[PDB]
Amino acid sequence: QDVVLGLYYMTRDCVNAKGEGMVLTGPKEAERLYRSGLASLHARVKVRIT
Amino acid sequence: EIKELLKLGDLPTSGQIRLYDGRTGEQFERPVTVGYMYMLKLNHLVDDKM
Amino acid sequence: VTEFLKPRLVDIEQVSSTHAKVTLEPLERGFGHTLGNALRRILLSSMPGCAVTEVEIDGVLHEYSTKEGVQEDILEILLNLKGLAVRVQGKDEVILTLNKSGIGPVTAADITHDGDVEIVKPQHVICHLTDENASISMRIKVQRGRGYVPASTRRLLVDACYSPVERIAYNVEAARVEQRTDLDKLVIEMETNGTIDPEEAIRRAATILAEQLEAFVDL
Amino acid sequence: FLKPRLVDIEQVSSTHAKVTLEPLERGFGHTLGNALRRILLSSMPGCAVTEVEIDGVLHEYSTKEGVQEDILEILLNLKGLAVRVQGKDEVILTLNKSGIGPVTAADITHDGDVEIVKPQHVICHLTDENASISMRIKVQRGRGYVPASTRIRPIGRLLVDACYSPVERIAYNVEAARVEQRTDLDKLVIEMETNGTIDPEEAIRRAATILAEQLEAF
Amino acid sequence: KPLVGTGMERAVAVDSGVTAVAKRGGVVQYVDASRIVIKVNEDEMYPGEAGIDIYNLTKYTRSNQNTCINQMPCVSLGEPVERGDVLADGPSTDLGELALGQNMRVAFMPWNGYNFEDSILVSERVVQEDRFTTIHIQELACVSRDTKLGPEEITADIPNVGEAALSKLDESGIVYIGAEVTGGDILVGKVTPKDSSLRVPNGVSGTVIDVQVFTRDGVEKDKRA
């Protein structure tokens, strides 16, 4: 009832963002972009994940 | 009538305003509901129950 | 009235290098978040550094294209170049060359040294080759800047990760001195790209913040 | 890295003013604004009433003949009193008043280095022709919020919950600075709202000094 | 007062009886923190036994649930008052209007799990301003029963106990009115024929605001009584 709301607002997508077409080099890059405010949490990007 | 009375001031009619985070200084990325609710204090005091 | 609990770095215990985890205590009530957020915001998007800005590969002219003999895609080449951590001396921007042929990996050790330019991870693989005739040569341009500048803000354009940090995330938890009730305990976790130490980056960011508050300080 | 300076301080009202910091680099505006706002709201020095000794009053749950208000209400009003004792760290104020009429904060016989910033602050209302009050107000400097139930003697000393915090509302604003030929330079406007017992520039300098001292660890 | 009400707050405030509602209209001749004197108009004054009417307010006193019911005036000196309008606000009353709480500036948002299931996250300004601070007047009784082996006493000398706990006691064994006693302090020093003195319950501070001594007719008296 609160952690599920956080994980549902986090893991979600809308068709627009601060940056959407960008392609990232890993999850750390995604966190850095979200914290720096250069990308919305609901972008649709391509991350490289191991 | 609630929305008209909100218009009488300068507050948004939707009832939701923009709140920034107290510690990180960055906005919450959605309008949140802010207003004056009449909270009570029930006399189920914690020091009378510990 | 003007006295505050001066913190001291209890431990700078390090995971595998460039992954230090610093924790200073005890902070005054509420100062943990101030210090953590200020240091994080400075380390994230305000930090001098050098990163690959743009790259020109002779065989391609478009991000959605390919070259025969290249195992990866052009997007994956740009991703490998984003992670190409480099350290550059006094020159503000240089151009590196990556002439390479023959079947095998294309590591960062096959880039021309050019003297002052030095790669901190020569084992960083950039491309893979599967054809004898596959001749790949690119001109990777590295420029000095501050913070993160996405390619969408500004002849292939690559995102420029100028700041040596890669993931900085503090965590404030409860600490107590002998009698005082509520204090803070800042726990800073930082991973860099190898061009700087995390404990060195912390003092760099602290110096940068302290220089800002020098024209209106009480000395 | 250009460094900011206090270029403007607009004392719009008696209590609240608007300082201005420029030039600020891109991104440093919000960092400095939030750090200084938290430091101002958390750790500024101020003066507050701590202990009150009314003459014929044994405890805060009683009443005195002549006044329109309970002793607890008088203690609350004295808690809402702003004072700017200059040199000392503890001053015993004094108040004597008689006759029908309000007992304002101007009636305090303050010494030389004690300055009441809001004389019109009503403490209590005397409602009798011949009835006087006599309270030995105690003022001392401090920091933060210190309730009377946690500090550390006779049967006539009324402890008051002291709130040593001159500021009440700190709001910063980041907007573009007008440099002759340059962009990406912000401008911080810390709109602070004190209660009059502190200078704005002194508050900003104290906040910056505290932040620099905290950074001195590394 | 509640900013959002229903209009029945005034009816409950007036009709409950906790508010000193004026019986005959007039002009407030003298308003004190413990009484109100109303100069009745000539229209409503009887020919004989006219005089004026005094409303003696009920100050800090204990209710059934150990709360504090205490009236305070809501009128000013020389202010015209009619018939059937409130003069003193009772407990949880604001100008003759039932006010059971404080107008709190709320925000509906998750805040780092501190309002997880039903919890409330309260700013420090709320406790700084003493908005929700409440007075809880509670009484303690020390009955002295004449048991076997002789009767009991309330003398101020307690065996096996130092003078630290007996400092607040007077020479008659009872505690002074106004003492800031904490949990574990001696209030009335009672000794059984061989120490069973009345002590404050643990974990509660307080302030002695009233002492009442009832003595059976036949026991002479004590100097505090």
Residue E65: which CATH number? 2.40.50.100
Distance CA D135, CA D140 (A): 16
- Determine contact, residues D171/D191, Cβ cutoff 8 Å: yes
Spatial CB neighbours of C180, under 8 Å, sequence gap ≥ 6: C5
Q: Spell out the long-range contacts of B27-32 with Cβ–Cβ below 8 A and sequence spacing 24 or more.
A: B28/E109, B29/A40, B29/A41, B32/E107, B32/E108, B32/E109
* Options 3.40.1080.10, 3.40.190.120, 2.170.120.12, 3.40.50.300; CATH of D45-164: 2.170.120.12
Nearest to E31 among D68, D73, D149 (CB): D68
Tell me the residue range of the domain where E51 lies.
18-92
Cβ-in-10-Å burial (0-12, 13-18, 19+) of A43 comes to buried
Query: Going along chain E, which residue ranges are E strands?
Result: 20-21, 26-31, 35-40, 53-56, 61-62, 68-69, 72-73, 80-81, 86-89, 101-108, 186-188, 198-199
Q: Is C132 left (phi over 0), alpha (psi -120 to 50) or beta?
A: alpha
Residues of B near A (CB-CB distance < 8 A)? Answer: 26, 29
| CATH value at residue E206 | 2.40.50.150
All residues of chain E having their beta carbon less than 8 Å from the beta carbon of residue A5 are: 110
Domain match, E139 and E208 both: yes
Nearest to C215 among D3, D25, D39 (CB): D3
Distance CA E35, CA D124 (A): 16
Distance CA E115, CA D60 (A): 36
Which residue's structure tokens are 């951590």? C85
Window 66-105 of E: residues touching A by CB (8 A cutoff) are none
Q: Do D100 and E77 touch (CB under 8 A)?
A: yes
Spatial CB neighbours of A37, under 8 Å, sequence gap ≥ 6: A18, B26
Distance CA D78, CA D148 (A): 14
Percentage helix, strand, coil for chain C under 3-state DSSP, each rounded to 5: 20, 35, 45
Radius of gyration of chain B (CA): 17
Percentage helix, strand, coil for chain A under 3-state DSSP, each rounded to 5: 35, 5, 60
- Determine contact, residues C130/C69, Cβ cutoff 8 Å: yes
Find the closest chain D residue to E168 by CA distance.
D155
At how many Å resolution was this determined?
3.4
- Determine contact, residues C88/C117, Cβ cutoff 8 Å: yes
Q: How far is CA E199 from the centre of its chain?
A: 21
Spatial CB neighbours of D102, under 8 Å, sequence gap ≥ 6: D122, D124, D125, D126
Shortest Cα distance from B21 to chain E (angstroms)?
Answer: 10
Mode of pairing for the β-strands spanning C156-157 and C48-57: antiparallel
All residues of chain E having their beta carbon less than 8 Å from the beta carbon of residue A1 are: 116-117
Distance CA D19, CA C216 (A): 12
- Determine contact, residues E120/E130, Cβ cutoff 8 Å: no
A41–B contact, CB cutoff 8 A: yes
Nearest to E109 among B28, B37, B39 (CB): B28
Q: Do B39 and E102 touch (CB under 8 A)?
A: yes
Q: Do A46 and C75 touch (CB under 8 A)?
A: yes
Spatial CB neighbours of B22, under 8 Å, sequence gap ≥ 6: D38
Domain match, E71 and E140 both: no
Spatial CB neighbours of C151, under 8 Å, sequence gap ≥ 6: A22, C157, C158, C159, C160
Distance CA C41, CA C35 (A): 10
Distance CA C8, CA D217 (A): 6
Spatial CB neighbours of E75, under 8 Å, sequence gap ≥ 6: E28, E31, E36, E81, E87
Breaks in chain E (C to N over 2.5 Å), named by the residue before each, are 194
Q: Do E110 and A1 touch (CB under 8 A)?
A: no
Q: Do B47 and E203 touch (CB under 8 A)?
A: yes
Find the closest chain D residue to C38 by CA distance.
D31
C148–A contact, CB cutoff 8 A: yes
Nearest Cα neighbor of E17 from E80, E94, E71 is: E71
All residues of chain E having their beta carbon less than 8 Å from the beta carbon of residue D66 are: 32
* Options 2.40.10.340, 2.170.120.12, 3.40.710.10, 3.30.572.10; CATH of C48-161: 2.170.120.12
Q: What residues form DSSP beta bridges with B9?
A: none
3-state class (DSSP) for residue A9:
helix
D51–E contact, CB cutoff 8 A: no
Distance CA D202, CA D44 (A): 10
All residues of chain E having their beta carbon less than 8 Å from the beta carbon of residue B50 are: 203
Shortest Cα distance from A26 to chain C (angstroms)?
Answer: 9
Q: Compute CA distances C79 → A22, C73, C154, D129, E181, whole Å.
A: 11, 10, 18, 88, 72
Query: Going along chain C, which residue ranges are E strands?
Result: 8-11, 14-15, 19-27, 48-57, 86-87, 93-97, 100-101, 104-107, 118-119, 125-129, 135-136, 138-146, 148-149, 156-157, 160-161, 165-173, 184-192
Give one DSSP letter per residue of C116-150, joined into a string. S-EES-TT-EEEEE--TT-EE-EEEEEEEEESEE-
Which chains pack against E, by 3+ Cβ pairs within 8 A? A, B, D
- Determine contact, residues E71/E29, Cβ cutoff 8 Å: no
Distance CA D125, CA D127 (A): 6
Query: HSE of A19 in the Cβ direction (CA atoms, 13 Å)?
Result: 22
Nearest Cα neighbor of C106 from C125, C81, C131 is: C125
Which residue's structure tokens are 């600075």? D177
B23–D contact, CB cutoff 8 A: yes
Q: Do E104 and B19 touch (CB under 8 A)?
A: no
Mode of pairing for the β-strands spanning E186-188 and D5-10: unpaired
Please name the method used to determine this structure: cryo-EM
Write down the H helix ranges in C52-127. 74-82
Q: Examine residue D23 and say whether the peptide bond preceding it is cis (omega within 30 degrees of 0).
A: yes
Mode of pairing for the β-strands spanning D191-194 and D16-25: antiparallel
B24–C contact, CB cutoff 8 A: yes
Nearest Cα neighbor of E4 from C15, D155, D121, B5 is: B5
Q: Give me the amino acid identity at E178.
A: G
3-state class (DSSP) for residue C3:
coil
Domain match, E138 and E210 both: yes
Tokens of D209: 């000094």
- Determine contact, residues E134/E100, Cβ cutoff 8 Å: no
Q: Which of A1, A2, A4 to mutate to test the interface with E (most CBs of E within 10 A)?
A: A2
Domain match, E88 and E142 both: no
Distance CA D193, CA E18 (A): 40
Domain match, E68 and E141 both: no
